């Protein structure tokens, strides 16, 4: 409140009057300078950056509300100076960031050669143009998120006002120490949740849920831990959108959390999609779910989207940076700069240290690092996956076999994960004629997630991105695929001609895939293909492990015993997690060599296995904490 | 007040005869107290009482109701009637809380009377319960001061127990799915021993010490600023032994609003308060801040509950505590915590010597069900094997007779309680025999006052020594050999005087009287210094022990002055109150039930890891060596 004034005074004393400052706000992680002279934005903020580096802050310049053009009139002036050439799809406005969102067929000519066209836009309207390429298909989810954000301007500004007020304070105490407390997904794969404590700050790294249909004592993170109180909590960071890592977030907002959430733009989008489906599933089966739609909305309002590499002040003593995890669209690793920096840490979350058809390999270059916290899903020597090539041949073989038998191939997948990777490869192999021309069916859920993909292309692999937006080969539109919604429709699918099915609930735990499974499991011609990791507990793993006598609800709700006779095939070398050797290589090749390693998100016996392996082959101390244990970082 | 309580009361009384004229049943601390209107029932060995006690697994105490207790003044009159004078009484005290009359006499057997006849009659006549004691050879200023405090706060103390008892005997709120221990001090170090046990229902501190090695606050005090620690949720504090590195921070808690109990042995409590008070006096005599005062030490006493070795006591709805002899110091204990269903119990050792000393019995190794064991590791690491004390004794005499005939004094710096006691015994015997030249040995007032407490708590001393003082009258703490030193003028007269033996307060040279004698005798080659206890990192003792000779400190007129050491520095290994490398190892072998997990504390970093490395390699038991803010899960 008072230390902030000194920050404001420093700005004004370093700035010319010509820059007509209206007010200086502390909005969230950043400092905002509002000017009554829009042309100032246009000029080089080099003097601005000189100030930013001087006070060690991020500084944004925007136009004051007074010098902003009425959106009505603002649109005319746009069409005036483009004009039709770069055919414009849509124009939107953002009352908070003072940006005009412009999506067009050819974004280049919205900008102008030396960025001169957009220069004219700001100079004439006062709006910062966000030049964006037209999405080949709109994503209902994003449209909704935008409506939420739009209609809640006033409220969002105050949240940012207050959040920023907490963030740029001088720390209350010295930074003697730092600690990490496990709260989930340790010596298990499930409720990934990690709790960082400073004498000043309390942050939660991931906040997930165990999807496996079991006890509450096994499905949720340990909030009942003495150290964790909700009021003390300064921020939640969400690596990627999988419910393993994000599913418990809406519970927090139900229990009265009032703070920020940080993640990549895709993460926020996918997250919302997955959580919303999680409501539809419970409403479908008549199961008491705690969080309503409202709690997802609150989550969205308090979410702060971050680009990869974008350094962010989230607490008086904590800078956050997100680096590409390359596991799922928008998946990220958290690098945390703590205090004086001498003891920084990195959390991986789920990651893959290999370029996929969809994503760029996980990052491995960072600022100074003391401690590394990595997943160990496929840890333990026995977990070397086969080469991408071999993995691909294997699939083709299975499908051809089924197709020749005249059957269908069911591949159960999460709405986002292996699904997209699978779609790229299948599209290609069919179109090329490596696989026989056969319809590939896809759950609305996956489809809707794909929409998000094409809409955040910057988060895809360069290779793929350029293939879509420069070469015009977009696999997700292909006539090969057919969108699926309604059990009514699905009935026809299973009764129809030999085909390939992608359906929701990655491990066969409820959802659509289960219903397909019911219909197809009793025919030896059909085959079930496993691609993702099958967690312990899940029916998927039970099936995989060889279980062939499964009891389920009937056409009505009658319990019926199902004698599985269909082919069960697991295809290794496709998972979103880096394999055993890749994990070990990731440690060999790091930015600064870490001095301590923690292992999480890993099956009990695989975690211990990797730990000794790492140490004996690299002589680096690795801790393998149990679920309620705490490790010191500083 | 509570329904769970009333239920117990009914079950108690429906199993009692009309003859037990029961006034009321109270829950007072860990125990259930039956007040009776018929004192003659106290007399009978409550065979039915103990039966009820085992059946409900609670501890039951019988007392006379305040109704049938005779006036204190009137009671005294009735007592002197029945001795009548032969067994010469020294002092008579009363305790409103326990309904107990305390009597110290020259001949206690005559106050009991054959067949307990006399004592029985005192109950019949006054309603008071006679606690009979022999009058100690020396009275303890500190023990008397405590007793006064307890008398003049009985009103409050009665209420304190009533609430505490009310909290303890409740049904556990949540299941006992998990248990965990947070290191808060004295881990990978020796300094602020403090340990935080937490269940879903209960929060207990094991030890609460101060790193006497006075430096930064961030290094001297335990880490209470850990998120998981609240003072409002803390159910109990357990103090193993009176040493400041285990007990010195306790008064801070009460300063900062702690309202709960402290558990320990009677001598521990007494010794505690002595060292705690001395620590306060030292700071104020040396113009230095300390975040607690006398006021707070008094509060600490008010809330203290003393226990005997092997006394099972309900601490929390899901915790039972038993203290076992640690053999380290007078009253030194290990803690056995029976948690929940008892499947995942733990033991904390504190400091301990797994060997019989002249002064104390060997550290207990026999316990009921255990899963986790937390032991000290001061002398971990293969290098830290100590030679037999028979050798240490011989090697000590050698040094003495050398320095003594050279025209020099022998300085031994010791904490008021510790090696001082042991040393005095072995010293007394050797001069009396004539193995040592007869020279006067000077003691600091502090060690003397500590001794007083030793002779007042006989039952905690080794069986041998207990027998030799209280049945043979060979009390070594009386020998004309020793001289109590108070004031500064006496100390100067020893330095200029003719050579002899010195014992001075503050073990490793922190300050106090210990630093005074040093700044008088170190520049003389004739003199020498002997280390007998452990030397912690942040001390001058540790520096002088490792070969360092030059130091900067203050003079008479508080002047920054140089001090050059020419004297002999001889360390006598094989006398510390900590069991050495061989004994620590042996302890793990002979431990009653084999633990399935071991945590190491109170050890030097490199030694801790060394030991742990060897524990696992030898016995293949998981050993954790947690850093100072880490948490280990027990269940
Ligand atoms: K809590
Ligand atoms: K605290
Ligand atoms: Zn995961
Ligand atoms: Zn994931
Ligand atoms: Zn490109
Ligand atoms: Zn000790
Ligand atoms: Zn100690």
Author numbering:
A (entry chain A): 3 to 636
B (entry chain B): 2 to 636
Manuscript text:
MTH1203, a β-CASP metallo-β-lactamase family nuclease from the archaeon Methanothermobacter thermautotrophicus, was identified as a putative nuclease that might contribute to RNA processing. The crystal structure of MTH1203 reveals that, in addition to the metallo-β-lactamase nuclease and the β-CASP domains, it contains two contiguous KH domains that are unique to MTH1203 and its orthologs. In vitro nuclease activity assays demonstrated that MTH1203 is a zinc-dependent nuclease. MTH1203 is also shown to be a dimer and, significantly, this dimerization enhances the nuclease activity.
The MTH1203 crystal structure was solved by molecular replacement at a resolution of 3.1 Å, using X-ray data collected at the zinc absorption peak. The MTH1203 protein has a tripartite architecture consisting of the two N-terminal KH domains (KHa and KHb), the central MBL domain and the C-terminal β-CASP domain. The two molecules found in the asymmetric unit are essentially identical and superpose with a root mean square deviation of 0.65 Å. Two zinc ions are observed in the active site which is situated at the bottom of a cleft in the MBL domain. The two zinc atoms are coordinated in an octahedral geometry by the bound phosphate and the conserved residues His242, His244, Asp246, and His247 from motif 2, His329 (motif 3), Asp352 (motif 4), His579 (motif B), and His603 (motif C) located in the MBL domain, similar to the active site structures of CPSF-73 and TTHA0252. A phosphate group present in the active site is a good mimic for the phosphate group of a nucleotide ready to be hydrolysed. The N-terminal KH domain (KHa, residues 1–70) was not detected by sequence analysis because it lacks the signature GXXG motif. However, this domain lacks the GXXG motif that is essential for RNA binding (Lin et al., 1997; Siomi et al., 1994), and the conformation of its helix-turn-helix structure, crucial for RNA binding, is different suggesting that the KHa domain does not bind RNA. Interestingly, the RNA-binding site of KHb is distant to the active site of the MBL domain, being separated by ∼42 Å with no significant positively charged regions observed on the molecular surface between the two domains. Analysis of MTH1203 using PISA indicates that MTH1203 forms a stable dimer in solution. This assembly, with a protein-protein interface area of 933 Å2, involves a symmetrical interaction between the C terminus region of each monomer, a loop and a β strand from the MBL domain.
